[PDB]
């Protein structure tokens with residue numbers, strides 16, 4: 001940031017870019033190293049009523065795997081999912 | 097059960113169940129079990145004589161097209177007489193799906209190599225040789241891949257200790273790195289952590 | 305290789321170079337396992353020394369049967385003319 | 387319209403995709419006639435191959451054929467037809483419509499132990 | 500008791516494979532002594548090969564000796580193709596390891612191991 | 614939702630062909646690369662003057678370990694062994710007994726700093742803020758066993774760095 005405008009002009013000419021608008025060295029635009037103290041929020045289970053753990057127990061809703069076939073007519077041939085939709089070319093910048 | 101519980105995907109569960117029935121009835125010669133997990137992952141548990149015919153099916157069939165071998169895995173489970181559980185994770189890019197193909201072997205029965213189906217397996221089952229001692233028949237260049245060159249023992253077997261049986265040091269008498277029996281200056285401290293209370297009643301096994 | 309006697313003397317020379325065989329009890333019809341008192345790997349390295357001397361390769365199906373120096377000189381005779 | 391590239395490296399553009407797909411589908415059905423009738427591979431593969439062959443015979447366009455076969459480019463549809471043909475030729479030799487060759491041990495797929 | 504074989508249908512094919520592996524190691528020992536520029540003799544290296552073969556000489560299972568021949572072929576390929584260094588060859592000669600007490604009385608003197 | 618990198622057909626009119634030939638014969642992109650290297654030549658470098666200038670750290674930084682005290686001199690560690698239970702590398706070795714006033718205190722608090730992975734699971738497992746991982750990162754030794762800290766060394770690191778450790782905890786305890 002302390003470069004003279006002659007060196008700054010030579011530098012912007014050699015790079016071809018306005019380098020002072022986007023400097024890679026950091027200055028007073030960055031955050032303070034001392035911040036105010038946060039007040040972090042609580043989640044949805046911080047409630048005093050209607051908050052039984054059995055109604056939100058994720059680990060105890062996991063089941064053993066359903067055995068579809070075990071060795072102890074004109075039905076449709078299936079796939080593991082529908083076929084994948086063809087991706088669309090970018091409207092942003094397709095390079096086309 | 098909205099915020100903290102994982103949302104269940106019923107559509108994928110029904111579709112993978114239908115495709116598991118599909119594979120179980122196209123290939124009843126080798127398919128032993130078919131299961132779908134609660135988080136919607138299909139497992140085809142097969143006989144080890146059908147490693148090539150099942151994997152060639154899923155790779156080449158027009159309703160499967162599992163063209164990618166994501167991962168090939170063994171698991172040592174010493175309580176089974178076929179202690180090694182060979183796991184083939186497969187990816188169909190056409191149907192955007194994943195399947196798991198599982199089989200078994202013990203220490204002495206060879207599994208047929210799947211390099212003719214997926215070339216990706218060339219190192220993976222090679223690693224299953226190095227880490228578990230599962231021999232793979234008709235592998236092109238089957239040898240060790242991760243251990244040291246004079247390494248005795250298959251380390252990811254669960255009877256193999258955490259520190260090994262040997263440790264290296266440089267010895268200035270012989271001017272050479274040497275191998276000696278392992279002595280730890282501090283033993284690894286085994287922690288018995290398991291609670292004496294049942295955690296998941298849905299997984300309760302029937303008693304004797 | 306020209307005559308059987310030179311092959312026999314050379315077989316016995318290779319056998320007496322082999323240090324585990326006692327050169328007194330070394331004869332033409334002595335057995336390796338029960339007379340000379342040898343391991344099987346001893347017989348295998350004897351056959352490899354015969355390949356070192358005689359300049360040809362002996363396969364496995366016809367080296368398991370070579371249990372005496374007479375069988376060795378007969379096998380070297382049969383893979384040549386004499 | 388003669389598509390310039392398929393976009394996939396090493397997958398060459400097919401000049402006549404319709405005739406190649408008709409040849410490959412009838413060849414799959416001819417190989418597939420040598421499988422027993424009750425085998426599920428035969429019933430399912432005849433079903434999907436007749437569906438794809440009727441879609442090919444119903445559409446003269448190449449682009450619309452790609453968008454209703456729904457298997458990507460037409461050349462990888464040809465590649466999948468070749469893969470299904472090779473598969474069915476192997477399924478004749480393997481005979482996987484047979485019963486199960488061996489039951490597993492009693493606690494082979496029991497998890498946890 | 501009907502098991503799938505690895506290479507050998509019986510023990511005689513297995514002994515054939517053991518024998519060919521021993522022939523290949525026996526031929527390899529002088530080249531191994533030379534190019535790894537070892538401090539042992541060719542006779543001492545062949546003694547170590549014979550010791551390692553006799554170590555497994557009690558096995559009666561064809562599949563176990565098939566895996567032993569497979570692992571010996573792997574060690575041989577690691578020796579011929581120079582993938583081992585000198586240290587991996589010399590690990591068969593436990594030289595820096597002090598000799599363990601063998602009888603009862605010296606094991607009593609040194610500690611608690613039976 | 615996808616784009617094609619490198620699927621451009623170059624124009625074949627005489628203008629563009631002569632542009633590409635002036636590029637080939639007159640090295641125009643090579644002068645462009647020399648220009649960008651010359652452009653960094655006249656920039657101020659990013660080089661700080663270590664050891665007089667220091668890299669910027671945050672108050673969360675996980676450096677050297679320290680056993681802390683209360684504002685009475687009593688050590689915070691009440692020997693609960695949670696830090697060595699959670700310790701992913703098993704670097705913490707703890708032995709305890711009741712001392713002369715009956716208090717639950719350690720007789721051994723070792724941290725092998727060459728097993729330690731510096732992940733700070735000990736300072737978040739600690740219920741009384743006894744073990745922390747302080748702000749010192751410049752503690753390289755000349756000997757391996759100088760990095761095998763016992764309870765005396767860790768309490769001395771606490772007494773050494775406490776004026777800084779307390780302020781870092783004061784900055785970050787409302788995120789914990």
Ligand code: SF4
Nearest residue numbers: 700729730732733735
């Ligand atoms: S920072 Fe991590 S590895 Fe280090 S002592 Fe603490 S818990 Fe153990």
Ligand code: SF4
Nearest residue numbers: 690691693694696739
């Ligand atoms: S440092 Fe903390 S976690 Fe570790 S034993 Fe002491 S009080 Fe417990």
